[PDB]
From a paper:
A notable feature of Prim–[name] is its favourable activity on short DNA gaps of 1–3 nucleotides, which it preferentially fills in with ribonucleotides.
To understand the molecular basis for substrate recognition and synthesis, we crystallised Prim–[name] (Prim–PolC4–336) in complex with dsDNA containing a two-nucleotide (2-nt) gap. Briefly, the elucidated structure shows Prim–[name] bound to a 2-nt gapped DNA substrate in the act of incorporating the appropriate ribonucleotide (UTP) opposite the templating base (A at position 0) in the single-stranded gap. The structure reveals that Prim–[name] contains a conserved phosphate-binding pocket, consisting of N20, K23, Y25, K35 and P65, that engages with the 5′ phosphate on the downstream strand, positioning the N-terminal region of the enzyme on the 5′ side of the gap. Binding of Prim–[name] to DNA induces a major splaying of the template strand by 97.3°. The templating strand sits on Loop 3 and N321 interdigitates into the upstream duplex region, flipping out a guanine base (T/G-2) from the templating strand, and causes it to adopt an extra-helical conformation. Residues in Loop 2 contact and support the incoming primer strand, which is docked into the active site of the enzyme, positioning the incoming 3′-OH within the attacking distance of the ribonucleotide analogue ([name]) and metal ions, thus forming a pre-turnover ternary complex.
Numbering used by the authors: 4 to 336
Write the structure that this text describes.
DNA sequence: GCGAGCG
DNA sequence: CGCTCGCAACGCACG
DNA sequence: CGTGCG
């Protein structure tokens, strides 16, 4: 019952416990072996190209999703020769040797370690100080769901990006909301990219004020879709495209076209369904890397909000007080 | 899930 | 030699 | 101290 060895594109990867249940609800389809089988099916394809050279955090469940959840940002000092690491710097100044996705064996090793979900930073190593991706995180609040997420993405955010001359790429998160990624030239730092995300989010909110909120404070959000602008800060990740999530049916964060997203149901994309869905279908994100976009149009939105008196917004807990950050508390008591 | 180190 | 146990994220601002 | 928030 000893370990076995997988051959992943020339690299030998150790593999154990194929029949350990990770997702109790799926029967024969919820074992660690089924997870590794999924990742072998996607790890050599667009998942890899989307993750290439990014530092990632691991969300591991060595005892399955009902056991303890272990987030992990550091790779152990002692690790297999084929693994590559990269130094990322947190807002405090502390650092971490994070996994760098360079090869499908990186993804397979992560899955052998119990990783259900990979969580990339928005940078490419070794240029870890300049995001190449601006990321929009759409979060339905209680009383809203995926339908609101997809409606706002398709009917407010998409036409707005069109107006601004920008191209965005959507995916299901695998939870109840939506992610939209914009590829940018790595010319700006985390502060500038987060401000550009704030101005984009504020414009979406102005155009759909009954449906959309940017309030960090839960009290002021209402039954609206929250655009989580702090996900563009340093030391903030997104679940990767094609990652499985810790939901009971093992949903997958699924890249879609705008046309597909209009009618999507995230429960259709599972570690059990996704490989068959990918076959006979063109990659909707095939072109994400063909244009490295400028942040200019969004930075002009920033300047125009400044003209109307709107500046920076609060950061999350555990961040140092940032330059220009307003009081990190809910307002007007 | 792994590995240092203890009985 | 066989086993247990520690360990595997980020850690401040505000009243 | 409790509470903020992914
Ligand atoms: O505790 C956490 C929560 C979230 N995150 C990271 O922040 C991202 C967004 O946090 P999120 O709660 O919005 N989750 P998401 O994957 O967007 O699903 P959903 O909002 O239900 O549709 C996640 O995808 C993780 O990468 C963490 O790193 N730690
Ligand atoms: C985004 As989660 C892993 O706290 O459901
Ligand atoms: Mn989200
Ligand atoms: Mn969020």
């Amino acid at each position: 019952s000893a370990a076995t060895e997988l051959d992943v594109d020339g690299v030998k990867v150790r593999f154990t416990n194929p029949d350990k249940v990770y997702f109790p609800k799926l029967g024969k389809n919820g074992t660690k072996g089924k997870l590794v089988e999924y990742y072998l099916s996607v790890a050599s394809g667009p998942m890899l190209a989307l993750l290439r050279d990014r530092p990632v955090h691991l969300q591991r469940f060595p005892d399955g999703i009902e056991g303890e959840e272990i987030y992990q940002k550091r790779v152990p000092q002692k690790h297999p020769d084929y693994l590559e690491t990269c130094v990322v710097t947190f807002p405090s100044g502390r650092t971490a040797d994070a996994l760098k996705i360079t090869h499908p064996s990186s993804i397979i090793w992560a899955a052998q370690m119990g990783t259900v979900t990979l969580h990339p930073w928005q940078v490419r190593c070794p240029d870890t100080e300049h995001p190449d991706e601006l990321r929009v995180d759409l979060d339905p609040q209680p009383g809203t769901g995926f339908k609101e997420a997809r409606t706002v993405a398709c009917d407010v955010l998409k036409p707005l990006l069109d107006e601004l001359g920008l191209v965005g790429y959507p995916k299901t998160s695998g939870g109840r909301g939506v992610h939209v990624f914009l590829r940018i030239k790595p010319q700006w730092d985390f502060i500038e990219v987060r401000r550009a995300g704030i101005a984009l989010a504020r414009e979406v909110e102005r155009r759909a004020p009954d449906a959309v909120t940017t309030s960090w404070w839960k009290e002021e959000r209402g039954e609206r879709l929250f655009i989580d602008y702090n996900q563009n800060a340093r030391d903030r990740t997104f679940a990767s495209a094609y990652s499985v999530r810790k939901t009971p049916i093992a949903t997958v964060s699924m890249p879609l076209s705008w046309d597909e997203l209009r009618n999507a149901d995230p429960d259709d994309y599972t570690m059990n369904t996704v490989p068959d869905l990918l076959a006979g279908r063109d990659d909707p994100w095939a072109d994400i890397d063909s244009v490295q976009q400028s942040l200019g149009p969004l930075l002009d939105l920033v300047a125009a909000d400044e003209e109307r008196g709107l500046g920076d917004l609060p950061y999350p807990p555990n961040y140092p007080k940032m330059p220009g950050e307003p009081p990190r508390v809910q307002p007007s008591k």
